[PDB]
């Protein structure tokens, strides 16, 4: 219920002043957000100021997308951690991909919720 699913979003998925963007960043990171027990198979981290996250969900920085999702208007500095191995237990290795392009959300009551990992899936 309350924020908590919007501050979720936040520790999985934002990182306003990354550093470098490497791989031994996302392997860092991951661990710092608790993503790796088990390790998460791909994530992405949105970068910059939270005002225009949060924006994406007013048609301030949004447009509908899909059955109930969000585009975002403006594009966004982003850093893609893919794991790399076989096994969901650490060590997680992760290959970093760092990026700039909109990104799809979920919202509610305003606010970022959920991020549409599958236009970061580059098969």
């Known amino acids: 219920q309350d924020n908590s699913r919007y501050t979720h979003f936040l520790t999985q998925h934002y990182d306003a002043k990354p550093q470098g963007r490497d791989d031994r960043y996302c392997e860092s990171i991951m661990r710092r957000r608790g993503l790796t027990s088990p390790c998460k198979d791909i994530n992405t ?42 096994s969901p237990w650490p060590p997680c290795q992760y290959r970093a991909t760092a990026g700039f392009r909109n990104v799809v959300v979920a919202c509610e009551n305003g606010l970022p919720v959920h991020l549409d990992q599958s236009i970061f899936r580059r098969p």
Do not use: D, Y
């Open 45 to 86: 981290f949105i970068h910059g100021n939270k005002r225009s996250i949060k924006a994406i969900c007013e048609n301030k920085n949004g447009n509908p997308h899909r059955e109930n999702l969000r585009i975002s208007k403006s594009s966004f500095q982003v850093t893609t951690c893919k794991l790399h191995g076989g």
